Structure formats: structure tokens, C-alpha cells
């Protein structure tokens, strides 16, 4: 079926939970043996969210190459994304090592450091220009260059230096700051505006490594971001845009990381975002 009318048909019939459970039943199951090794317990935020072995990002290190991060490679859309958990106190250096090694231009953050009164990720970037951060375990230096605070999101320019080689690179930090503590946003307008700002920066384009996107677990809000982006790109590429099937795209993405889209409300919000976004594109 088309999307917008499939949408009203699920609303009128109140069957979002059943649609979402079908997706959960059909989703791929692949091994995640490296994530579960005992030496990696303090590298995982949640015991039930792990990268598959076949798609995990490897650190360029011989001691321990593990990080909780996955490469989502979308062949028809010609887009790639790295989805990862919010960094932990003992993985902030690994996080920036990955950004460096994978040649990423942008980092997309969809959570606040504290939500619901608890810490959802480490403070992994510097908050003042004159107070830079040094990660001694991976030999990197990170400096805040500029910050632009808007009503729904903040954009930061950061300088990452590889201290071994003295090479430097400019990284863009896109921080969506207004996702509610509970539920999903009422309108997708600010989320779509944010997606378009990431696109306009070059961070999603083939001349750079894959964008790094995270929330707390790296599957819920993060899944919504890449699912909406890929669906809108396919609607622009194809002769028949009504052939784009959001459930089929989500199942393809779940071949590369488990659990993408965590609730039926997130599924409905993804439909809403793609529907409204397709009108603005034209
Ligand atoms: C998927 C979708 O409906 C998007 C779309 C955009 C433009 C056109 Cl002309 C058409 Cl038929 C569909």
C-alpha cells in the first residue's frame, strides 16, 4: 500500500502495536559473540543492545578492537551510517578513535547528557574553547572551535588532532536538544528541519566517511533518523515514489543492527516524518 493512506488505515484501526510486533518477529538474528566476551562488559551500556559481528566497527588496535557500533550500508539509496551507543566514561577515547579512523565529518547526537534524572551518556566534548580535552588512551586532542545554539538544536565546530601524526580535522557536532523525556515529538517539523541541516553540511555525502549517529542505546531515536533520511532519498531517486515501503526499509536496516525503532510510537512518528518530508521536498 501507499504510505499516507496505510497510515490513516492503521490510525483508524488502532493497530500500531500489532504492526510493530510483526516487524519484531521478522527481524534478523545474527551472532554478537565479540560484544559478549567478558573483557568487553564495561564497553556496553545495556546488556541487551549489542552490535552484530558481521557489521560491527573495528578499532585499529591489536589489544582490543571492540566498540558498541554498527555500519548500516544502504545499497540502493547509496548512503551509509554508523549507529552507536552514547559513550561511557571508559569509552570516550574509543569513540573519537572511531571518528578519526572512519574519516567521518559529522556526529549526530539525539539525546541530552541527563534525562529523567539519570546520566544517558558521558560529557564527551569540551564546553569551553579554552578548556580542551585530551584522551590519553587513544592519543587524541579535541577542541571546541565555535557553538551556535538554536531553539531546537545546537551545532558545534570541533577540531580533532591525532597527536601521533599532528594531523588535524574539522568535525561538525549536530545536537538535537528537544526530544521529550517521554514519548515522541507531537510534530515532525523540527526533527525534519534538523535532518536537512545535517544534509546541507556535507556530513552525509559520499566524499566523507559515514556519519556517526547516537542516542543513549543507539537504536531508537537513532533508528528514526536514518530510516527517515533513507526513505526520503529513495522517494527522490525512484520513478514511482509511492513504491517506497517503510517497513521493508526498516527490516533491511535491522540486518545491520538489532532493535532499530524501539516502540510503536517511534514507528508511527517515522511514518509521520517521511509523509510530511515528502511534501516539502517538492
Ligand atoms: C512516496 C511518495 O508518494 C512520494 C511521491 C513524491 C512525488 C510524486 Cl510525483 C509521487 Cl507519485 C510520490
- Distance, in Å, from the CA atom of 248 to the CA atom of 25, rounded to the nearest integer, reads 13
> What is the DSSP track for 59-76?
PS-SS--EEEEEEEEETT
- Distance, in Å, from the CA atom of 200 to the CA atom of 51, rounded to the nearest integer, reads 29
- Distance, in Å, from the CA atom of 143 to the CA atom of 127, rounded to the nearest integer, reads 9
Residue 270, phi then psi, degrees to nearest 5: -65, -45
CB of 244 sitting under 6 A from ligand 1: yes
234 CA to centre of ligand 1 in angstroms: 10
Residue the block writes with cell 564527551: 124
Q: Give which of 96, 191, 188 is closest to 137, Cα–Cα.
A: 96
Q: Is 223 annotated as a binding residue?
A: no
CB of 215 sitting under 6 A from ligand 1: no
Q: Is 262 annotated as a binding residue?
A: yes
Which three cell numbers mark 241? 515514489
Helix residue spans in the chain (DSSP H): 3-13, 16-26, 92-101, 189-200, 221-237, 246-253, 264-281
- The atom of ligand 1 lying closest to the CA of 240 is 11
Q: Give which of 108, 72, 78 is closest to 203, Cα–Cα.
A: 108
- Distance, in Å, from the CA atom of 134 to the CA atom of 182, rounded to the nearest integer, reads 34
- 125 Cβ contact partners less than 8 Å away, ≥ 6 residues apart: 133, 142, 144, 156, 158, 173
Are the C-beta atoms of residues 265 and 224 closer than 8 Å to each other?
no
- 239 Cβ contact partners less than 8 Å away, ≥ 6 residues apart: none
Q: Give which of 105, 118, 172, 119 is closest to 144, Cα–Cα.
A: 172
- Distance, in Å, from the CA atom of 204 to the CA atom of 229, rounded to the nearest integer, reads 10
- Distance, in Å, from the CA atom of 245 to the CA atom of 274, rounded to the nearest integer, reads 11
Are the C-beta atoms of residues 201 and 163 closer than 8 Å to each other?
no
Resolution of the solved structure (Å): 1.8
Q: Is 53 annotated as a binding residue?
A: no
Give the determination technique: X-ray
1 CA to centre of ligand 1 in angstroms: 13
Active site residue 231: no
Just give the CATH number of 1-282: 3.90.190.10
Amino acid at each position: 500500500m501507499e504510505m499516507e493512506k496505510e497510515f490513516e488505515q492503521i490510525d483508524k484501526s488502532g493497530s500500531w502495536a500489532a504492526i510493530y510486533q510483526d516487524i519484531r518477529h521478522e527481524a534478523s538474528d545474527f551472532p554478537s559473540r565479540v560484544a559478549k566476551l567478558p573483557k568487553n562488559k564495561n564497553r556496553n551500556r545495556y546488556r541487551d543492545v549489542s552490535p552484530f559481528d558481521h557489521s560491527r566497527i573495528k578499532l585499529h588496535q591489536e589489544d582490543n578492537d571492540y566498540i558498541n557500533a554498527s555500519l548500516i550500508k544502504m545499497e540502493e539509496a547509496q548512503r551509509s551510517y554508523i549507529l552507536t551507543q552514547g559513550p561511557l566514561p571508559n569509552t570516550v577515547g574509543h569513540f573519537w578513535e572511531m571518528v578519526w579512523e572512519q574519516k567521518s565529518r559529522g556526529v549526530v547526537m539525539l539525546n541530552r547528557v541527563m534525562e529523567k534524572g539519570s546520566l544517558k551518556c558521558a560529557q564527551y566534548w569540551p564546553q569551553k574553547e579554552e578548556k580542551e580535552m585530551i584522551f590519553e588512551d587513544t592519543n587524541l586532542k579535541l577542541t571546541l572551535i565555535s557553538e551556535d545554539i538554536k531553539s531546537y538544536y545546537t551545532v558545534r565546530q570541533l577540531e580533532l588532532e591525532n597527536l601521533t601524526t599532528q594531523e588535524t580535522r574539522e568535525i561538525l557536532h549536530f545536537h538535537y536538544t528537544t526530544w521529550p523525556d517521554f514519548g515522541v515529538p507531537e510534530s515532525p517539523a523540527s526533527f525534519l528541519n534538523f535532518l536537512f541541516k545535517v544534509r546541507e553540511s556535507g556530513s552525509l555525502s559520499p566524499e566523507h566517511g559515514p556519519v556517526v549517529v547516537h542516542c543513549s542505546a543507539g537504536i531508537g531515536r537513532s533508528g528514526t533518523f536514518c530510516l527517515a533520511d533513507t526513505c526520503l532519498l529513495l522517494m527522490d531517486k525512484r520513478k514511482d515514489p509511492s513504491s517506497v515501503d517503510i517497513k521493508k526499509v526498516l527490516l533491511e536496516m535491522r540486518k545491520f543492527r538489532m532493535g532499530l525503532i524501539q516502540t510503536a510510537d517511534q514507528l508511527r512518528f517515522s511514518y509521520l516524518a517521511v509523509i510530511e518530508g515528502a511534501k516539502f521536498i517538492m
